[PDB]
Amino acid sequence: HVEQTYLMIKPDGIQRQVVGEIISRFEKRGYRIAAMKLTIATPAILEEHYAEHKGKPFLPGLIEKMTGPVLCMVFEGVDVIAQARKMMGSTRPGEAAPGTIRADFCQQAGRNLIHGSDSAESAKREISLWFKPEEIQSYKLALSDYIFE
Amino acid sequence: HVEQTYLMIKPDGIQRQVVGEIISRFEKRGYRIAAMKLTIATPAILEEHYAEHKGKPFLPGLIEKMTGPVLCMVFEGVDVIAQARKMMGSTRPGEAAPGTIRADFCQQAGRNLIHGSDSAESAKREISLWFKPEEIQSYKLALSDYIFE
Amino acid sequence: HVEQTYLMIKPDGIQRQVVGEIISRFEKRGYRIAAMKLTIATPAILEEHYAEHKGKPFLPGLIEKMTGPVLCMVFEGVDVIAQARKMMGSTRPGEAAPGTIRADFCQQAGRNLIHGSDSAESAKREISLWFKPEEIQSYKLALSDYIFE
Numbered sequence: 001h002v003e004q005t006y007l008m009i010k011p012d013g014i015q016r017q018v019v020g021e022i023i024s025r026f027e028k029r030g031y032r033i034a035a036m037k038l039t040i041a042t043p044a045i046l047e048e049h050y051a052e053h054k055g056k057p058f059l060p061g062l063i064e065k066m067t068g069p070v071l072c073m074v075f076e077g078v079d080v081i082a083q084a085r086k087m088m089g090s091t092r093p094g095e096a097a098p099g100t101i102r103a104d105f106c107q108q109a110g111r112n113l114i115h116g117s118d119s120a121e122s123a124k125r126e127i128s129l130w131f132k133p134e135e136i137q138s139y140k141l142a143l144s145d146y147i148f149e
Numbered sequence: 150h151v152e153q154t155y156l157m158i159k160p161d162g163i164q165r166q167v168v169g170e171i172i173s174r175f176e177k178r179g180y181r182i183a184a185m186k187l188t189i190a191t192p193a194i195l196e197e198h199y200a201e202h203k204g205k206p207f208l209p210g211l212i213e214k215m216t217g218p219v220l221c222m223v224f225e226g227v228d229v230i231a232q233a234r235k236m237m238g239s240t241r242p243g244e245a246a247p248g249t250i251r252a253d254f255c256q257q258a259g260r261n262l263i264h265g266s267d268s269a270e271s272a273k274r275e276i277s278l279w280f281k282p283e284e285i286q287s288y289k290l291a292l293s294d295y296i297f298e
Numbered sequence: 299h300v301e302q303t304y305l306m307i308k309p310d311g312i313q314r315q316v317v318g319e320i321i322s323r324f325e326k327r328g329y330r331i332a333a334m335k336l337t338i339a340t341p342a343i344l345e346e347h348y349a350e351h352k353g354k355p356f357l358p359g360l361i362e363k364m365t366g367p368v369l370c371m372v373f374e375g376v377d378v379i380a381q382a383r384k385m386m387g388s389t390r391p392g393e394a395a396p397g398t399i400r401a402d403f404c405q406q407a408g409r410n411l412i413h414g415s416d417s418a419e420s421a422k423r424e425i426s427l428w429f430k431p432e433e434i435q436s437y438k439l440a441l442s443d444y445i446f447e
């Protein structure tokens with residue numbers, strides 16, 4: 001049984017030109033690209049994306065940092081929501097484990113390269129926010145017999 | 150004082166075409182390739198390899214998944230039995246530490262890319278099962294003075 | 299607020315020809331190269347460098363193993379003293395976390411590839427020992443807005 005998670009490369013990932021390296025880490029585990037789109041995030045969509053932080057003092061500066069080019073992604077795999085969070089590492093790069101994206105690429109939480117859904121409910125909500133159903137692509141990986149039990 | 154461990158790239162490592170990447174991880178630490186052989190694992194040899202699991206319900210499907218091309222390897226180094234196990238990571242990739250082979254490449258225990266001996270006794274048994282003595286090569290690494298104390 | 303740490307590639311890092319790989323790991327986090335110099339370490343300077351270890355049983359052999367080409371480096375970043383130590387990993391490569399330099403490249407404490415300052419005080423002292431102030435270069439990284447909060 002597979003699930004789908006929402007992963008988003010933030011503007012610092014675009015501007016530091018590590019998009020391909022990020023994608024390769026997820027492809028390396030046999031996770032399937034189910035959707036992908038480059039866009040420029042707007043405050044209106046970011047307010048909904050970060051609805052959990054509404055009213056908090058840091059929300060205006062988070063939205064400002066995120067107003068820029070982003071790569072919206074959906075990846076599919078076993079336990080991929082929790083696993084992608086593990087691969088990303090802790091919010092604060094200095095506390096993230098070696099070998100995670102944030103530890104390997106970043107210094108501070110405010111520029112930590114990538115977002116990933118933190119739960120099944122948030123993944124469903126975030127995928128629906130950033131993608132229309134017609135943009136989610138269903139196909140089978142040819143190596144499936146060697147990736148899955 | 151060095152020891153030798155038996156490492157085997159399973160059919161998923163061959164079919165996903167990551168053999169060279171796996172070998173490079175062990176070469177990177179200055180471990181010496183003492184033996185290397187491509188073969189196709191058969192049920193009779195796999196029954197002896199997995200003798201500890203005889204009779205268990207999961208063994209038949211394990212043998213089926215392992216019936217395929219494998220790369221038999223012997224690596225030599227300080228504490229290499231335990232260290233190779235650490236490098237592979239937990240049997241279940243989702244529990245494996247970031248930076249390990251199974252965490253970086255895999256999703257499920259039944260397709261977890263690689264086997265390594267779990268003890269000195271199993272290394273001796275497994276090397277004897279999969280290799281003839283003529284296939285174990287004795288030579289010295291030229292960089293030894295910069296690898297070992 | 300950024301700080302500066304002293305990092306030194308030991309003779310095993312030079313001789314195994316992994317200098318570039320080491321530098322890339324620090325550049326990948328947006329750490330800035332503030333100083334860099336190839337020299338051959340001599341006992342007199344190494345005695346001052348390792349002054350804290352005076353009298354310990356491994357010191358004479360440590361000085362012998364360190365008498366050779368070294369790459370002196372200063373890197374700048376947020377919390378870079380502690381973070382570089384985390385990236386290097388434990389003194390013993392066998393205890394170091396997967397994904398650290400020592401775990402990925404080495405086997406034994408006596409050949410563990412790299413030195414890094416362990417504190418703000420030792421970083422100040424080591425930078426002054428190996429570099430004159432005129433050798434420390436100040437410039438701003440063009441991607442600073444995407445590395446720092």
Ligand SMILES: Nc1ncnc2c1ncn2[C@@H]1O[C@H](COP(=O)(O)OP(=O)(O)NP(=O)(O)O)[C@@H](O)[C@H]1O
Nearest residue numbers: 149207211239240241258259260261263264265267
């Ligand atoms: N619950 C399970 N479900 C699926 N496959 C399993 C399970 N438990 C074990 N396996 C498979 O059987 C192998 C042998 O189990 P075990 O010897 O306990 O793990 P290991 O030593 O980490 N791996 P191996 O290289 O096969 O010896 C595992 O590597 C998996 O490929």
Ligand SMILES: Nc1nc2c(ncn2[C@@H]2O[C@H](COP(=O)(O)OP(=O)(O)O)[C@@H](O)[C@H]2O)c(=O)[nH]1
Nearest residue numbers: 062090091092109110111112114115116118447
């Ligand atoms: N500067 C700064 N940014 C933060 C802090 N906490 C969170 N953020 C930013 O806000 C984003 C969303 O916060 P959160 O959902 O709690 O963290 P995440 O799930 O790891 O992305 C993070 O990824 C960070 O970029 C903080 O303490 N300082």
Ligand SMILES: Nc1nc2c(ncn2[C@@H]2O[C@H](COP(=O)(O)OP(=O)(O)O)[C@@H](O)[C@H]2O)c(=O)[nH]1
Nearest residue numbers: 298356360388389407408409410412413414416
């Ligand atoms: N052979 C050997 N070398 C050691 C030992 N302890 C320390 N060293 C070496 O001495 C160096 C400096 O020691 P220390 O400052 O404690 O370790 P570091 O801060 O991790 O570099 C280490 O990096 C090792 O190369 C030991 O027990 N045996």
Ligand SMILES: [Mg+2]
Nearest residue numbers: 115116117118
């Ligand atoms: Mg979050």
Ligand SMILES: [Mg+2]
Nearest residue numbers: 264265266267
């Ligand atoms: Mg076993």
Ligand SMILES: [Mg+2]
Nearest residue numbers: 413414415416
């Ligand atoms: Mg020290």
